[PDB]
Design a protein around this ligand. Structure first.
Ligand SMILES: Fc1ccccc1-c1cn2ccnc2c(NCc2cccnc2)n1
Length: 287
């Protein structure tokens, strides 16, 4: 750590504080996150891709763990809050979604899941790029109910299989989270802002219909499934994400399929017609 000068506190992450810091040597500006785990994290150093925030180094000393990351200037949560009045233009939403799917496709091809995607871990730059932060940390350290600062870990983007107690969820969980984020960028409101596990599940059910054996073979056997769940009818996506076009609604619908085995993969999503006219606009960032 004596190699880094702290510039400012960025925030409190899931596992520890995150600081903007300067390498007293290279003068490089980085993000420093103050946190079997060592081996898992160490593997992440080679999982490099333009849409994945680079893990520069791991420092383990005095039994304390610091992760040194590539620094980006803003996160998607802040960008969305800042774009509230007018919304993020569709072409930028499309570019972001396309880039995030590329990041997922890459990680998923290596059998590495993120597991806790949310706007706070999607970082953006002035060039129009967006990158996934904290990839792989959930498997390395787990996902707590509350952060080290006691802040509640959001449930809003959690896939239904996780909520229903699946022990061995798949890469499909990240596709669900990203679909939730896609909807939120379009409508300027979180899709399923649950404030407890059952509220999160019931919010999903009220919009997508209570899952049954027809749409999700095996659902009724899942550990936390209860036959006493209320049976709500599915809503049309035209009501859920106006004014998204049919291509976007079609893709969203596939990213939010209940059955994880049938939910679209990141690779398949990249080929969806919605991306026919994708471009890479520059966001307006006031740093
Ligand atoms: F530059 C980075 C590299 C790796 C992780 C986060 C950042 C990073 C850099 N940032 C610069 C401005 N805002 C952020 C930001 N916000 C997300 C956030 C909020 C609270 C706690 N943790 C993250 N994260």
């Amino acid at each position: 750590m004596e190699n880094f000068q702290k510039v400012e506190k960025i925030g409190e992450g899931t596992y520890g504080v995150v600081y903007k810091a300067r390498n007293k040597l290279t003068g490089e500006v980085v993000a420093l996150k103050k946190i079997t785990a060592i081996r898992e994290i160490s593997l992440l150093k080679e999982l490099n891709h333009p849409n994945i925030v680079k893990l520069l180094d791991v420092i383990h000393t005095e039994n304390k763990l610091y992760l040194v990351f590539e620094f980006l200037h803003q996160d998607l949560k802040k960008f969305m809050d800042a774009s509230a009045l007018t919304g993020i233009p569709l072409p930028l939403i499309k570019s972001y979604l396309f880039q995030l799917l590329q990041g997922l496709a890459f990680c998923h091809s290596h059998r590495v899941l993120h597991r806790d995607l949310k706007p706070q871990n999607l970082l953006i730059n002035t060039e129009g790029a967006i990158k996934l932060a904290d990839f792989g940390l959930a498997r390395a350290f787990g996902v707590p109910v509350r952060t080290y600062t006691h802040e509640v870990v959001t449930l809003w983007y959690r896939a239904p299989e996780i909520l229903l107690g699946c022990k061995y969820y798949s890469t499909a969980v990240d596709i669900w989270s990203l679909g939730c984020i896609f909807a939120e960028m379009v409508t300027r409101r979180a899709l399923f802002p649950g404030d407890s596990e059952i509220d999160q599940l019931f919010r999903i059910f009220r919009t997508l219909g209570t899952p049954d054996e027809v749409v999700w073979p095996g659902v009724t056997s899942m550990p936390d499934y209860k036959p006493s769940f209320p049976k709500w009818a599915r809503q049309d996506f035209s009501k859920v994400v106006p004014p998204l076009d049919e291509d976007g609604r079609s893709l969203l619908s596939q990213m939010l399929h209940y059955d994880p085995n049938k939910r679209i993969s990141a690779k398949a999503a990249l080929a969806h017609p919605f991306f026919q006219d994708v471009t890479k606009p520059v966001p307006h960032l006031r740093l």
